[PDB]
Every structure is written in C-alpha cells, then in structure tokens.
Design a protein around this ligand. Structure first.
Ligand SMILES: [Cl-]
Ligand SMILES: [Zn+2]
Ligand SMILES: [Zn+2]
Lengths: 217, 217
C-alpha cells in the first residue's frame, strides 16, 4: 500500500495516516546538537532467539521467541521485532550510515520504545548478520532462520545512547515513542549491507525537524 | 465557543480542534520527576509596557508595547501577550498553585514559546498585580491600564526553570511549543487571586500524561 516514493510515498503518507503529516515530534532526526543529561543505563536483557525473517514489502523484519526485554523508566517493554533501513534514517553528527536496525519494543499495554543501532562498514563480515541474512525472503514471504541466533549479539558492546521523544518512522507514524539511539555503531561489511539494500531498496524516511525537543546524552 | 466545562468543555475540544484530543505531547503536566541537564540560562529582556487587559471569555490577557524578547535556542521569540489561569494548570512536585501566568512568545516565523510563572499566596499584595488588575474587564471587553507597568517586574527574581516540550493549553492545543516553567513562584495575595478567579472562573485544563518526554532542570 504505502511506499517511499511515488503516489503513496512519504510525501503522501498523510492521505491515510494523519500523524505522518501533522505530527511535530517525528522520527528520524539528525542527532547533532545535544544536551548533557543524567540518564539511567538501559536494561537490555535479550535471552531468546531470532526465529525468522519476514519481508512485508517495506523492510526485512526479524521475529523472536523467548524473553527479550527492555526495562527503562519503570516500564517493561518486550522486544516485538527488529528490522532494517538502507540507508539509515537517523543521522549521527550529520552522518548518514549505510544501515540502521530498529529494535521495536512494547509494554503489555501497548506503549512503544525503539532502540536504534547504526551499522557502519567494516572489513569483516558481521557473523551475526551472516547468520541472520543467510536467506532473505522476497516480498510477501517469510523464511525460517536455518541457524540459532540471540538478538543480544547484534547490539553494540558499549550501551551509551542518545535519547529523544519521537514517533514511528513508518505509517501510522504514531507519536509518544521513546527513542534510544546507541552511540556506538555496529559493523556490517559493505557486501552485507548491499545484499540487504538490493532486497529492500531505499526505505529511509527523510529527516524531520527537531522543533521544541532536545536530544539528550 | 469552546469552554472548560459542559458541551464544549475540555472533554470535547477534539470536536473542532483535533490536536487537543489526539496529541501525546500536551501541556499541562505535573512537574514531579525530573532529569538533571545542562541547560542555558534564558535571556528575558523585557523593556516595554503593559497597555491593556482583554477578557475574551477564556482568560484575562495583557497586551504589550515595546521590546520584550525571549532569546533561547538561537531563536528570538517576542512576547505577544501574557494571561492567567485560576487555579494553575501545571503542578510543581504534585502541588497545584492558586494562579499561573503564561507569557506567550513567538518568533517572527510563528514558532511559540511559553514562560510560565506560578503565583503562590503571600501576606502582601503584589504591587505589580495591583497595578495590572486595578480594573479587570468583563467578558468581551478590554480596559486600558490606568498606570505604567513593565512586564519584567512580574517575573521572579531567580530565573532557574524546568523545560519541556509541549503544547498550547487552549484550543487549538498546537504542539511544538517550548515550555519554560520558572522554579521560583511569584507572590499574589489570596485576595488578588480571588479577584481574578471571580472574573475568569475555573479556566485550568486537566493534567496531561508525560508519555515519552522527560522534564529537564
Ligand atoms: Cl521531548
Ligand atoms: Zn524502522
Ligand atoms: Zn495559558
């Protein structure tokens, strides 16, 4: 239905999804100027498995089993899925990355929090991505992972983050979404990112204005 | 048209003003739990005069002449008006105040910023309020101030503030509004606040959820 370019592209998401066009607390943003703040460490307890990839024609999405939980702000947000954008949607200090992962979590009441991880180029294939992407499903299809994989291993080692209040970056672009963007990029070889990009195409939403928000670190 | 209670009261503002019902970055809030952050001092340069009071059936609003400017975030926000709510709309640490002033500023491009000042009870009449409120207009009317008054003198001496990203507290409840709530209350005698309340009635919007925001100090 909706797309990135064309008649149903980002410029027209408001036709069916009002918040995409009317909201002024949207994601993505350029994380450039920031405010130093006293922020609690995230509690990311990922103990389960990635089971499958789904291609819904918008992204490649990984689904999970087991207990994979983000605890922050006194709320318990279970990891629902993670998925990818090529190129990145958010920027860090004016830099766009080749690949960005969104780990999307929800409280049992439905409140959403996204942990974003940038993937920059490195010389070596990322082993966890090799496992994850061994078979990437085509549009409208799903593939069961051949091999075991814990999503914990896709997070960077260092867990410092930028925090802001934003939205989903895809329709319905709902607001009230906590964003935690990890400061340290993970690595993906250029070949790995190209493999994903050739399936997904350009599925990065354009940058949105910060407006009255401050970005914290 | 719109009101606080009844058919067109706060519970029904969404009928004509969608953001009032759909927004999740709204004002007012209870400023209770906060995040320590490195925030720039506000630059409040009020050098003009309060000319008149207008009663638009929603509040008592004071209009200005001269140069009265808030500079923050590299943007220049000119004071457009200030007005009052009885009781307060925002709370500080779970406490509602008898009276809250909103100093509403706009950049020349139209972007809005509100400086909020709580007024608590004190033994002495506030001299600037005595001047300001010597004649309070009835609904649908305006009164020219009898005496000179610089709005600077209504701000607290100490300028430390809480900051959050929110909305107008009246229709259209627009978002993308910077809120700077002064930490130090000003003083108004109980008699002065009662004088205003008897004209305005209860024009405080109920508290709104913080959602994904953090309040900074
Ligand atoms: Cl915010
Ligand atoms: Zn995403
Ligand atoms: Zn107000």
């Amino acid at each position: 239905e909706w797309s990135y370019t064309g008649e149903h592209g980002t410029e027209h998401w408001g036709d069916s999804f009002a918040t995409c066009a009317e909201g002024v607390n949207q994601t993505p943003i350029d994380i450039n100027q920031t405010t130093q703040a006293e922020l609690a460490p995230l509690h990311l307890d990922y103990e389960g498995q990635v089971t499958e990839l789904v291609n819904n024609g918008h992204t490649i999405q990984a689904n999970l089993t087991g207990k994979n939980t983000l605890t922050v702000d006194g709320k318990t947000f279970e990891l629902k899925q993670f998925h990818f954008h090529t190129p990145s949607e958010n920027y860090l200090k004016g830099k766009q990355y080749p690949l960005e992962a969104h780990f999307v979590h929800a409280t049992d009441k439905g409140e959403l929090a996204v942990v974003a991880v940038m993937f920059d180029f490195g010389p070596r294939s990322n082993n966890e991505l090799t496992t994850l992407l061994a078979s990437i499903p085509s549009k409208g299809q799903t593939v069961e992972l051949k091999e075991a994989l814990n999503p914990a291993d896709l997070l960077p080692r260092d867990r410092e983050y930028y925090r802001f209040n934003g939205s989903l970056t895809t329709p319905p672009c709902s607001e009230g979404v906590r964003w935690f963007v990890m400061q340290e990029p993970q690595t993906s070889s250029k070949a790995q990112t190209e493999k994903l990009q050739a399936v997904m195409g350009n599925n990065a939403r354009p940058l949105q204005p910060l407006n009255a928000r401050l970005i914290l670190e």
